């Protein structure tokens, strides 16, 4: 693959090439991408959507913002080293190290934009509705891939639809640069086959059947390498996708842990115990000992640990840069960390004390009821749009092919805020 092509500035529907050298420095396509996400309705909605815990706890927006900041740093540092390794990219094509920061920052800002409320239980609730709920009836009317899109409904694939949703007067959705869409695509495959390997890029899927033709255009423009040997399509990751993934990995590992401590779910003593190897060479022990509040000590450790992992991930990427370019790299960047034992201890403690706390379990149980009810109401009205009641349901929840209609119902349920889903649920139940 060619970095020249991986850094495409193309937007959907373009009829002429966009030369990097001719970009206006005050309107660089990669940086416009960031601003477009910031002002978009789907991004704004993340303000009222939950990450893990339903006092201050990170929302999807604040999480996405922090990932995009760590991502910009990764892309900036890697970009400087890529331009030193491949100097024609600058001298000939005019790329600059801040271009790489901008691409990673933008894709990182949007990486969770398609996620449904109630976190991962939300996805499972939607899939179960089509696996064994009312949605079962549609199986015989859908292709294997169309149905697999529903029973394994994936927030990452919905995020791609949100970024690229064509509408009357708004073709191409947000019309992000193709390099940014490539960096966003962690799982460059369709829903079938299911886990053809245990490579991270094969663990899930990245686009619905409704968006297959769009990602084909993206993958062709970027010159991504074909990976699947069959009629099921799969491509090797855009190299910058590894940096979006590492920014995400670093943030939820360390910041969930910090939230769990500040919330009282994790005892404080674990902060120094689990992060001491991650911070040992850079911590200022006199500064730490002078800090009086728990939250300031943990935030100091978090900042040191994120700094350590950013620097290491940049070094990992450069060490394996040619394997990533050739699609032969089989792991995440963080998988190769020398602190993998510390990262695993941190994650397993977060799982035990946060994800399995009674409050998270109660929200997940409630999310199953809410989402299932909304899906059944939308689907029963789809099947019998003529009755007076189903018309009211349509007015309240949604003011094409069967598959197109079902994937749209999932996308609309998924982008409801936590509060709108509860309200619509209560009204359908009468409260």
Kindly list the residues in this chain that would bind Mn ion in the complex (CB under 5 A).
Answer: 112, 248
DSSP states along 325-344: HTT---S-TGGG-TTHHHHH
Q: Which is nearer to a copy of itself, 277 or 420 (CB)?
A: 420
Closest separation in Å from C-beta 63 to Mn ion: 6
Q: Does 384 bind a copy of itself (CB under 8 A)?
A: no
143 binds, among a copy of itself, Mn ion, none (CB under 5 to 8 A by kind): none
- Look up residue 34 and give its two tokens: 């960031």
Taking residues 262 to 301 in sequence order and writing x for each that binds a copy of itself by CB under 8 A, - otherwise, the string is -------------------------xxxxxx--xx--xx-
Confirm or deny that 212 is annotated as ligand binding.
Answer: no
Closest separation in Å from C-beta 15 to a copy of itself: 16
Q: Does 326 bind a copy of itself (CB under 8 A)?
A: no
Which span (48-56, 121-129, 343-351, 362-370) binds a copy of itself, by CB under 8 A? 48-56
Q: Is the dihedral of CA 398, 399, 401, 407 positive or negative?
A: negative
The three-state secondary structure class of 269 is: helix
From CA 274, how far away is CA 346, in angstroms rounded?
7
Q: Does 373 bind a copy of itself (CB under 8 A)?
A: no
Within 10 angstroms of residue 202's Cβ, the number of other Cβ atoms is 19
Closest separation in Å from C-beta 302 to Mn ion: 16
Residue 141: alpha-carbon gap to chain centroid: 30
The three-state secondary structure class of 148 is: helix
From the list 158, 197, 241, the residue with the least C-alpha distance to 411 is 158
Q: Which is nearer to a copy of itself, 228 or 299 (CB)?
A: 299
Confirm or deny that 32 is annotated as ligand binding.
Answer: no
From CA 111, how far away is CA 212, in angstroms rounded?
18
Between vectors from CA 225 to CA 220 and to CA 228, what angle results, nearest 5°?
Answer: 105
DSSP states along 6-31: HT----TT--S---GGGS-GGG-HHH
Q: Which is nearer to a copy of itself, 55 or 140 (CB)?
A: 55
Confirm or deny that 364 is annotated as ligand binding.
Answer: yes
Between vectors from CA 175 to CA 173 and to CA 178, what angle results, nearest 5°?
Answer: 130
Binding a copy of itself (rule: CB under 8 A), the pick from 22, 56, 213, 386 is 56
Confirm or deny that 248 is annotated as ligand binding.
Answer: yes
Q: Does 168 bind a copy of itself (CB under 8 A)?
A: yes
Q: Does 97 bind a copy of itself (CB under 8 A)?
A: yes
From CA 269, how far away is CA 267, in angstroms rounded?
6
Closest separation in Å from C-beta 254 to a copy of itself: 11
Q: Does 428 bind a copy of itself (CB under 8 A)?
A: no
Q: Does 26 bind a copy of itself (CB under 8 A)?
A: yes
List Cβ neighbours of 186 (8 Å cut-off, separation of 6 or more). 111, 156, 200, 201, 204, 206, 237, 241, 244, 245
Q: Does 41 bind a copy of itself (CB under 8 A)?
A: yes
- Look up residue 284 and give its two tokens: 């200022």
- Look up residue 70 and give its two tokens: 């760590």
Which span (13-21, 45-53, 330-338, 346-354) binds a copy of itself, by CB under 8 A? 45-53
Binding residues for Mn(2+) are 63, 111-112, 248
Q: Binding residues for a copy of itself, per CB under 8 A? A: 25-26, 34-35, 38-39, 41, 44-45, 47-48, 55-56, 58-59, 61-62, 65-66, 69, 73, 76-77, 80, 97-98, 167-170, 287-292, 295-296, 299-300, 303, 417, 420
């Amino acid at each position: 693959a060619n970095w020249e092509h991986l850094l495409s500035l193309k937007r959907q529907g373009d009829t002429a090439k966009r030369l990097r050298i001719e970009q206006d420095d005050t309107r660089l396509g990669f940086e416009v991408d960031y601003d477009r996400i910031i002002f978009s309705a789907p991004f704004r909605s993340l303000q009222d959507k939950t990450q893990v815990i339903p006092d201050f706890v990170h929302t999807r927006l604040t999480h996405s913002l922090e990932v995009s900041v760590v991502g910009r740093s990764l892309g900036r540092m890697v970009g400087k080293k890529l331009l030193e390794k491949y100097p024609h990219l600058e001298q000939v094509y005019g790329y600059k190290f801040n271009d790489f920061g901008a691409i990673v920052a933008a894709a990182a800002l949007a990486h969770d934009i398609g996620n449904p409320p109630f976190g991962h239980s939300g996805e499972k609730a939607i899939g179960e509705f089509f696996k064994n709920g009312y949605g079962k009836r549609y199986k015989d009317s859908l292709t294997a891939k169309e149905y697999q899109d529903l029973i394994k409904f994936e927030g990452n694939a919905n995020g791609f639809k949100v970024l690229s949703q064509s509408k009357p007067g708004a073709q191409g959705g947000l019309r992000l640069s193709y390099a940014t869409l490539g960096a966003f695509m962690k799982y460059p495959k369709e829903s079938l086959p299911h886990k053809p390997s245990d490579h991270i890029a094969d663990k899930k899927y990245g686009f619905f059947q409704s968006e297959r033709a769009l990602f084909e255009d993206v993958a062709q423009e970027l010159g991504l390498l074909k990976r699947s040997t069959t009629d099921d399509v799969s491509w090797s990751r855009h190299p910058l996708a590894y940096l979006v993934e590492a920014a995400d990995d670093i943030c939820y590992t360390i910041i969930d842990f910090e939230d769990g401590i500040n919330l009282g779910l994790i005892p404080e003593e674990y902060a120094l115990e689990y992060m001491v190897k991650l911070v040992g060479q850079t911590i200022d022990r006199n500064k730490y000992n002078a800090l009086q509040e728990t939250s300031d000590r943990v935030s100091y450790l978090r900042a040191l640990a994120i700094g350590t992992l950013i620097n290491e991930s940049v070094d990992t990427f450069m060490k394996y840069e040619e394997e990533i370019l050739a699609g032969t790299f089989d792991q995440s960047l963080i998988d190769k960390s020398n602190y993998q034992a510390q990262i695993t201890d941190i994650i397993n403690l977060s799982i035990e004390r946060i994800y399995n706390s009674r409050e998270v379990i109660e929200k997940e149980i409630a999310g199953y009821e809410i989402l299932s009810t909304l899906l059944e109401a939308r689907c029963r009205a789809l099947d019998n749009n003529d009755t007076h009641y189903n018309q009211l349901i349509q007015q309240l929840l949604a003011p094409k092919s069967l598959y197109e209609n079902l994937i749209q119902i999932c996308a609309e349920v998924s982008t409801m805020t936590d509060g709108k889903a509860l309200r619509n649920y209560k009204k359908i139940k009468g409260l």
